[PDB]
Structure 1
Amino acid sequence: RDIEAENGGAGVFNVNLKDKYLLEDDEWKNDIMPEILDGKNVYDFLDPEIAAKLQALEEEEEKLENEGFYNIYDGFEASEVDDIKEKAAWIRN
């Protein structure tokens, strides 16, 4: 009430909803949390244990990269195949 009286009256005084909050570090009082990134929302991806699940994800991806995951017909050599292809394209046109 009196801090209001000091700064400015009821309809002018902008209270900081912060300054009451309880944190590990106090120097970060005037920070902001990002809400939206490219398409996603931060609140959905934000867990305390995300770096470990990301480590597991990277382990899995590196296993697949070593595996065969990211990787002519007999009778016709290659130019025969191209000849057949161009003849068929000509026929359709």
Structure 2
Amino acid sequence: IHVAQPQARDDVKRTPFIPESVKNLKKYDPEDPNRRKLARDIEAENGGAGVFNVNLKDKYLLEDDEWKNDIMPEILDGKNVYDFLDPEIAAKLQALEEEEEKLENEGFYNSIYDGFEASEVDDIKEKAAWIRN
């Protein structure tokens, strides 16, 4: 029956970690007039075990309980929303909205033959259209 040891390797060591809320927690008692209910007792009080529905929501922390049950979009025309959301979107989008304003004035968006005028630059294309037919 061999047992092993830490064997004095390095100076860095942990003490084992127990949260204080478990030491503050009362010990659970099975036959008990006053007690916390259970996940069982909420399950069997309305329908049986397999047929009762448990909300996975209303069990998680947020800023407001008003949006604890809201629904994410998850898909738009733009590909999928879980890829687009971020920290500082609008801070990064104003770096994009500034990329319009330097291009608008410089003529990046903007709407003729030498020696040949409107009746002559048209008619060469008009005479060539007859030759191809």
TM-score normalised according to structure 1 size: 0.94
Structure 1 residue corresponding to 2:85, chosen from 28, 33, 46: 46
Q: Deviation string for 1:40-78 (max 9, x for gaps)?
A: 100010102110111010011111011110012111012
Which structure features the higher share of helix residues?
1
% identical equivalent positions = 100
Q: Which runs of 5 or more residues in structure 2 are unaligned? A: 1-39
From the CA coordinates, give the structure whose radius of gyration is larger. Answer: 2
Q: 1:57 to 1:39 in 2, by over 3 A?
A: closer
Query: Residue 39 of structure 1: CA displacement?
Result: 4.2
| Structural RMSD (CA) | 0.9
Task: Could you tell me which runs of 5 or more consecutive residues in structure 1 were left unpaired when the two chains were aligned.
Answer: none
Structure 2 length-normalised TM: 0.67
Instruction: State the aligned residue count.
Output: 93
Q: State the structure with bigger RCO (CA 8 A, min sep 6), 1 or 2.
A: 1
